[PDB]
């Protein structure tokens, strides 16, 4: 036929891509960072515990001031917390209790959330009525909302389980751009520090790098066996880490277009729910289904610490923009601030 | 007592928020949450017709001092294992199966009949790790159409291992036993089975009778016995 000739053309292009990226692999990152002196044992102790949620916390997002954080749980509430004093600043009752994601705007005026109702609702925090209001609701996905991330007060990238990411204009309510190309449910999303790129990992063991202005897929990253649940950019904007269900974190470089490091252990057999980097990018913190978090030395692939405070699965984590603390939320209804 | 005036008023605001959160969690804790599963054309829609009269569809009904919330998740065409843990801790799972889909082959592909598809879905959610202890109310729907269709098209179309009568009650009891035989661990969870048509008006009484046992078990867990 002709479509089989086109798929032989696609297989020729795929092994050309693989040979051109194995031509770049001259030395691994474990050879470059061999004589780098190790991190040592990272002993982070839990400093606060945020106790107001009554169900499983599915997401959390730090504000840009590194003090306020929002957390969404499936009792239909999202609480904004003051992490310094453990105070509750607001508690927003959600219209659908089945939240999977929550986002904080970098201005601090908006929070977004969404989930199994396929809508990223957007909540105005800075109202002169004194109560939080639903400013906009963004329908247009045909699968569940799995990640929302703000760029401005007027733009938000939402990833979803209809194999599609989308860029939204908030004040009109319409999708500006649709990002298609994944063949499984897009589970995670991480914007670049310049917010001109974002990576999105899906359930087809793939991570794709998207240009927000052009609307296209620039690079596609493989290496995982199972569904990528977590994705997080490096602070340089030149690499990212993906966590997946095959009990493995992997670091992928953008300008090299392949995988640099893999963070595995033979005791680790459960999937990875959340990843984030520290402020330097030296530590890769990863949350697990074995109820604890592991601190990975991201340059040497050595386990540098265990954050072992939770009684159920760590579903969400975030490092502050200060670099000062890690928040880890979990299915046991608690947020813990670690330092 | 080393707080400011505004820090003390923020602590008072956070305690009022905690009071409203505690009261809303108490109001949500006395509500019966029901997953509604089943394949297509299995009579889920006539059951949502029977109880009260994009995304997840929520249905509320109150029946004899008990507020129910029924979640239909048939709309989301996604990989189910990425969100099925959201309904961990649901009170029961209502599973609708059309009895008349024993001979009806699936329109997705004609190698799979619809009763084997629903048996695969029941084996998937029955032996889930999130529903190890969750009671399952299995509704076997459209028994009048099954009564008309078992007269001439036998159950050897669907179950070729079956040897029995070509009447309603022997074939229906075989289908119910074939569904109830699908739990790998038959000790932790309870499966309830009820035959349904469009004319029945006691299926909500069957559902209330089945969730009274889950309420008794959770009351014993609240009172420290487990």
């Amino acid at each position: 036929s002709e479509l089989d000739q086109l798929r032989q053309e696609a297989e020729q292009l795929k092994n050309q891509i693989r040979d051109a990226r194995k031509a770049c692999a001259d030395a691994t990152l474990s050879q470059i960072t061999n004589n780098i002196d190790p991190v040592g044992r990272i002993q982070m102790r839990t400093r606060r515990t945020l106790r107001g949620h009554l169900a499983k916390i599915y997401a959390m997002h730090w504000g840009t001031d590194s003090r306020l954080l929002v957390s969404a749980s499936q009792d239909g509430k999202l609480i904004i917390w003051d992490s310094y004093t453990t105070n509750k600043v607001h508690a927003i009752p959600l219209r659908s209790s089945w939240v999977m994601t929550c986002a904080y705007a970098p201005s601090g005026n908006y929070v977004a959330c969404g989930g199994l109702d396929n809508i990223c609702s957007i909540y105005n925090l800075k109202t002169r009525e004194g109560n939080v209001r639903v400013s906009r609701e963004l329908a247009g996905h045909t699968g569940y909302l799995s990640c929302c991330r703000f760029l401005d007060d007027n733009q938000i990238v939402t990833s979803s389980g209809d194999t599609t990411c989308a860029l939204w204009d908030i004040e009109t309510g319409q999708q500006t751009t649709t990002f298609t190309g994944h063949t499984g449910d897009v589970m995670s999303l991480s914007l670049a520090p310049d917010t001109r790129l974002f990576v999105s990992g899906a359930c087809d063991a793939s991570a794709k790098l998207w240009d927000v202005r052009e609307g296209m897929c620039r690079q596609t990253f493989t290496g995982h066996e199972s569904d990528i649940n977590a994705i997080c950019f490096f602070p340089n904007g030149n690499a990212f880490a993906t966590g997946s269900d095959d009990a493995t974190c992997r670091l992928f470089d953008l300008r090299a277009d392949q995988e640099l490091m893999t963070y595995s252990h033979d005791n680790i057999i459960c999937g990875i729910t959340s990843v984030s980097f520290s402020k330097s990018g030296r530590l890769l913190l990863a949350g697990y289904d074995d109820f604890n978090c592991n601190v990975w030395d991201a340059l040497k692939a050595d386990r540098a610490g265990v954050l072992a405070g939770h009684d159920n699965r760590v579903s969400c984590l975030g490092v502050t923009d200060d670099g000062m603390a890690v928040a880890t939320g979990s299915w046991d209804s608690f947020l813990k601030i670690w330092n | 007592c080393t707080l400011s005036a505004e820090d003390k008023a923020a602590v008072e605001r956070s305690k009022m928020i905690d009071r409203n959160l505690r009261e809303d969690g108490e109001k949500a804790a006395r509500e019966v949450k029901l997953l509604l599963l089943g394949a297509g054309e299995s009579g889920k829609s006539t059951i949502v017709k029977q109880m009260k009269i994009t995304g997840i569809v929520e249905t509320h009904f109150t029946f004899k001092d008990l507020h129910f919330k029924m979640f239909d998740v048939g709309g989301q065409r996604s990989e189910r294992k990425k969100w099925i843990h959201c309904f961990e801790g649901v009170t029961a799972i209502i599973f609708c199966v059309a009895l008349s889909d024993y001979d009806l082959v699936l329109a997705e592909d004609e190698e799979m009949n619809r009763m084997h598809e629903s048996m695969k879905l029941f084996d998937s959610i029955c032996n889930n790790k999130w529903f190890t202890d969750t009671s399952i109310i299995l509704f076997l729907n459209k028994k009048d159409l099954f009564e008309e269709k078992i007269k001439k098209s036998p159950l050897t179309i669907c179950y070729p291992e079956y040897a029995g009568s070509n009447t309603y009650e022997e074939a229906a009891a075989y289908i119910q036993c074939q569904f109830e035989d699908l739990n790998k661990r038959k000790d932790t969870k309870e499966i309830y089975t009820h035959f349904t048509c469009a004319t029945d008006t006691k299926n909500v009484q069957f559902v209330f009778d089945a969730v009274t046992d889950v309420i008794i078990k959770n009351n014993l867990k609240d009172c420290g016995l487990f």
């Epitope: 009525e129 109560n131 | 400011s4 605001r13």
Partner: single-chain antibody, 233 residues
Framework: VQLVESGGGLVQPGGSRKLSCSAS????????MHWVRQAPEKGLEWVAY????????YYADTVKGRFTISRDDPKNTLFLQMTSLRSEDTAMYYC??????????????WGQGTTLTVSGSADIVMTQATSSVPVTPGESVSISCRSS???????????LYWFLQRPGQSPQLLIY???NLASGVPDRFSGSGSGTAFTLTISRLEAEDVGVYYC?????????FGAGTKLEL
């Protein structure tokens, strides 16, 4: 957002009056409420406070025992039951809404005020040393306030609030917590200071900035204002 104070008028001395302020257009139950009076050409004087949820009530010691502040949260109405009314209680009484969380704007909306005409060394003294600055438009004007105590707290906030009362109007908040600009306020206004010495810089003054300017501390109850600094064209 609107607050209409009602009551007041000719009250015999020793008598009684209930002031009432109906609130419309905002989530009234989450705001703490204040009464702030103003003697017929004196400065602002804080009277009472009720919390959100009514769980914390303060009074000035000038009115303690004689005044009772109470809110009715379904009817959206704040009351000040005033007994034993003296000739010093002749004032114009403002309702002020004030919400308190991390990063909130207290004292941000003031009511129009009703006129009642009846016919404390531990308090932080806010001293506005200048009382009148005559100024032509276009100029950059600084207004200085001085505090008896260091308004800087150990959490890092210095609780100093700036208000402007235009002629024939309610005071409106210009600056909260010594530097943060209020909503609906131009960036002409700026605030600075260490503990005990504070500045309000009106850069490039327009004709709408004419009025009396008040500092206020919110570090400790009772809340105390400055005497006020008049600006004239």
């Amino acid at each position: 957002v609107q607050l209409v104070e009602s009551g007041g008028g000719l009250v015999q001395p020793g008598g009684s009056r209930k002031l009432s302020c109906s609130a419309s257009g905002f989530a009234f139950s989450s705001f703490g409420m204040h009464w702030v009076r103003q003697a017929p050409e004196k400065g602002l004087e804080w009277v009472a406070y009720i919390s959100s949820g009514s769980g914390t009530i303060y009074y000035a010691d000038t009115v303690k025992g004689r005044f009772t502040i109470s809110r009715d949260d379904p009817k959206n109405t704040l009351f000040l039951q005033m007994t034993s009314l003296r000739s010093e209680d002749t004032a114009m009484y403002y309702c002020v809404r004030s919400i308190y969380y991390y990063g909130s704007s207290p004292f941000d909306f003031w009511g129009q005020g009703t006129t009642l005409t009846v016919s404390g060394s531990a308090d932080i003294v806010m001293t506005q040393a200048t009382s009148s600055v005559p100024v032509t438009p276009g100029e950059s004007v600084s207004i200085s306030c001085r505090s008896s105590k260091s308004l800087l707290h150990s959490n890092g906030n210095t609780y100093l609030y700036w208000f402007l009362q235009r002629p024939g109007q309610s005071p409106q908040l210009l600056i909260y917590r010594m530097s943060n600009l209020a909503s609906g306020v131009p960036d002409r206004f700026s605030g600075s200071g260490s503990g005990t010495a504070f500045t309000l810089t009106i850069s490039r003054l327009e004709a709408e900035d004419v009025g009396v300017y008040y500092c206020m501390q919110h570090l400790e109850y009772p809340l105390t204002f400055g005497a006020g600094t008049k600006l004239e064209l």
